[PDB]
């Protein structure tokens, strides 16, 4: 549980980096 | 022309970084 929520909080900022630059979190958030 | 193609070759790798991590280049490539 701590591993899945740690990778959730790790790759949440990775998808923040993927979505905020305009012009591993779905499955990880689902398992978490 | 050299400035627009330099920013093309600069931000092409930026959108490579944006698209290869799965789960400024459109307008720059159009002007170039």
Contact A25 B24 (CB under 8 A): no
- 3-class secondary structure for B6-30? HHHHHHHHHHHHHHHCCCCCHHHHH
Contact A2, A31 (CB under 8 A): no
Locate B3 and state its tokens. Answer: 């400035």
The experimental method behind these coordinates is: cryo-EM
Going along chain A, which residue ranges are E strands? none
Element (H, E) at B4: helix B2-20
Query: Which of helix, strand or coil describes residue A23?
Result: coil
- Cα angle, residue B29 at apex, residues B27 and B32 outer, rounded to 5°: 110
What's this structure's resolution in Å?
9.0
Q: How many CB atoms lie within 10 A of CB A25?
A: 19
CA B12 from chain centre, in angstroms, equals 3
Q: If you count residue pairs, one on A and one on B, with CB atoms under 8 Å apart, how many are there?
A: 16
User: Which chain B residue has its CA at the smallest distance from A18's CA?
Assistant: B18
Locate B2 and state its tokens. Answer: 């050299």
Q: Write phi, then psi, for A21 (nearest 5 degrees).
A: -70, 95
Q: For an interface test with A, which of B23, B25, B28, B31 has the most A Cβ atoms less than 10 Å from its Cβ?
A: B23
């Amino acid at each position: 549980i701590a591993k899945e929520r740690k990778l959730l909080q790790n790759k949440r900022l990775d998808l923040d980096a993927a979505k905020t630059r305009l012009k591993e979190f779905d499955r990880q958030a689902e398992i978490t």
